[PDB]
Design a protein around this motif. Sequence first.
Motif, PDB file in Angstrom:
ATOM      1  N   UNK A 148       2.984   9.725 -13.757  1.00  0.00           N
ATOM      2  CA  UNK A 148       4.377   9.480 -14.227  1.00  0.00           C
ATOM      3  C   UNK A 148       4.464   8.097 -14.877  1.00  0.00           C
ATOM      4  N   UNK A 149       3.787   7.129 -14.324  1.00  0.00           N
ATOM      5  CA  UNK A 149       3.836   5.759 -14.908  1.00  0.00           C
ATOM      6  C   UNK A 149       3.053   5.733 -16.224  1.00  0.00           C
ATOM      7  N   UNK A 150       2.034   6.542 -16.338  1.00  0.00           N
ATOM      8  CA  UNK A 150       1.233   6.557 -17.593  1.00  0.00           C
ATOM      9  C   UNK A 150       2.153   6.827 -18.790  1.00  0.00           C
ATOM     10  N   UNK A 151       2.885   7.953 -18.765  1.00  0.00           N
ATOM     11  CA  UNK A 151       3.803   8.322 -19.852  1.00  0.00           C
ATOM     12  C   UNK A 151       5.005   7.377 -19.929  1.00  0.00           C
ATOM     13  N   UNK A 152       5.478   6.913 -18.805  1.00  0.00           N
ATOM     14  CA  UNK A 152       6.646   5.989 -18.813  1.00  0.00           C
ATOM     15  C   UNK A 152       6.339   4.791 -19.716  1.00  0.00           C
ATOM     16  N   UNK A 153       5.151   4.261 -19.626  1.00  0.00           N
ATOM     17  CA  UNK A 153       4.790   3.094 -20.481  1.00  0.00           C
ATOM     18  C   UNK A 153       4.912   3.487 -21.955  1.00  0.00           C
TER      19      UNK A 153
ATOM     20  N   UNK B 209       9.084  -6.035  -9.604  1.00  0.00           N
ATOM     21  CA  UNK B 209       8.404  -6.120  -8.306  1.00  0.00           C
ATOM     22  C   UNK B 209       9.336  -5.729  -7.154  1.00  0.00           C
ATOM     23  N   UNK B 210      10.602  -5.571  -7.430  1.00  0.00           N
ATOM     24  CA  UNK B 210      11.558  -5.191  -6.354  1.00  0.00           C
ATOM     25  C   UNK B 210      11.874  -3.697  -6.455  1.00  0.00           C
ATOM     26  N   UNK B 211      11.151  -2.983  -7.275  1.00  0.00           N
ATOM     27  CA  UNK B 211      11.412  -1.522  -7.415  1.00  0.00           C
ATOM     28  C   UNK B 211      11.274  -0.849  -6.049  1.00  0.00           C
ATOM     29  N   UNK B 212      12.081   0.141  -5.779  1.00  0.00           N
ATOM     30  CA  UNK B 212      11.995   0.835  -4.463  1.00  0.00           C
ATOM     31  C   UNK B 212      11.901   2.345  -4.688  1.00  0.00           C
TER      32      UNK B 212
ATOM     33  N   UNK C  10      -2.244  -2.523 -16.747  1.00  0.00           N
ATOM     34  CA  UNK C  10      -1.010  -1.866 -17.262  1.00  0.00           C
ATOM     35  C   UNK C  10      -0.081  -1.542 -16.089  1.00  0.00           C
ATOM     36  N   UNK C  11      -0.589  -0.880 -15.085  1.00  0.00           N
ATOM     37  CA  UNK C  11       0.265  -0.537 -13.914  1.00  0.00           C
ATOM     38  C   UNK C  11       0.759  -1.827 -13.255  1.00  0.00           C
ATOM     39  N   UNK C  12      -0.093  -2.808 -13.140  1.00  0.00           N
ATOM     40  CA  UNK C  12       0.330  -4.092 -12.510  1.00  0.00           C
ATOM     41  C   UNK C  12       1.424  -4.737 -13.361  1.00  0.00           C
ATOM     42  N   UNK C  13       1.308  -4.649 -14.658  1.00  0.00           N
ATOM     43  CA  UNK C  13       2.344  -5.255 -15.542  1.00  0.00           C
ATOM     44  C   UNK C  13       3.702  -4.619 -15.245  1.00  0.00           C
ATOM     45  N   UNK C  14       3.735  -3.328 -15.050  1.00  0.00           N
ATOM     46  CA  UNK C  14       5.030  -2.655 -14.755  1.00  0.00           C
ATOM     47  C   UNK C  14       5.609  -3.222 -13.458  1.00  0.00           C
ATOM     48  N   UNK C  15       4.810  -3.307 -12.429  1.00  0.00           N
ATOM     49  CA  UNK C  15       5.314  -3.854 -11.139  1.00  0.00           C
ATOM     50  C   UNK C  15       5.770  -5.300 -11.345  1.00  0.00           C
ATOM     51  N   UNK C  16       5.086  -6.032 -12.182  1.00  0.00           N
ATOM     52  CA  UNK C  16       5.482  -7.448 -12.427  1.00  0.00           C
ATOM     53  C   UNK C  16       6.879  -7.483 -13.048  1.00  0.00           C
TER      54      UNK C  16
ATOM     55  N   UNK D 195       0.817  -1.222   0.000  1.00  0.00           N
ATOM     56  CA  UNK D 195       0.000   0.000   0.000  1.00  0.00           C
ATOM     57  C   UNK D 195       0.851   1.273   0.000  1.00  0.00           C
ATOM     58  N   UNK D 196       2.004   1.233   0.609  1.00  0.00           N
ATOM     59  CA  UNK D 196       2.868   2.448   0.641  1.00  0.00           C
ATOM     60  C   UNK D 196       3.500   2.667  -0.737  1.00  0.00           C
ATOM     61  N   UNK D 197       4.166   1.675  -1.260  1.00  0.00           N
ATOM     62  CA  UNK D 197       4.809   1.831  -2.597  1.00  0.00           C
ATOM     63  C   UNK D 197       3.735   1.847  -3.690  1.00  0.00           C
ATOM     64  N   UNK D 198       2.725   1.030  -3.558  1.00  0.00           N
ATOM     65  CA  UNK D 198       1.654   0.993  -4.596  1.00  0.00           C
ATOM     66  C   UNK D 198       0.973   2.361  -4.689  1.00  0.00           C
ATOM     67  N   UNK D 199       0.652   2.955  -3.572  1.00  0.00           N
ATOM     68  CA  UNK D 199      -0.020   4.285  -3.605  1.00  0.00           C
ATOM     69  C   UNK D 199       0.945   5.342  -4.149  1.00  0.00           C
TER      70      UNK D 199
END
Length: 161
Positions: free
Chosen positions: A29-34, A157-160, A148-154, A16-20
């Motif tokens: 920021x993730x929208x354009x990053x994709x 998944x160790x992103x900090x 789409x956002x879940x795919x990036x974390x997949x 919840x902390x990193x996801x939010x």
Amino acid sequence: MGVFCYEDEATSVIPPARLFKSFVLDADNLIPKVAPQHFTSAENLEGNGGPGTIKKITFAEGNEFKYMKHKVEEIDHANFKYCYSIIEGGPLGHTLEKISYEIKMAAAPHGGGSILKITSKYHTKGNASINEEEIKAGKEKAAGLFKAVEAYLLAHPDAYC
């Protein structure tokens, strides 16, 4: 009242902390990053990207004004709650004075599973009624964005943060 309120339920094991901060705070920021499409563009009409911020997105560029407009109802990262409201979008809806969507996140007691909840608000003239199926379609679109956002974390998944 005169407004229909619907809530969506989503169960998934995500921080919840990193996801939010990565999905809600880094949502723009993730929208354009994709880099999904380069034919569309978003612009902030007012606000710094928080509560009361006005953002507009248009599929075509070169227009002084955008037919579609986006307005945020309120953003509270402290409570992990986000409020999104829509002023106008293409057809918008029939007898639908306004359509708003809110995204909220919560942590389960197990300590290893977060649940996401979404709320929608539709202002109807009064003698008009909204069908759950008609609003259900809007939910499907929101679910696609989550994939789409879940795919990036997949992929990381160790992103900090």
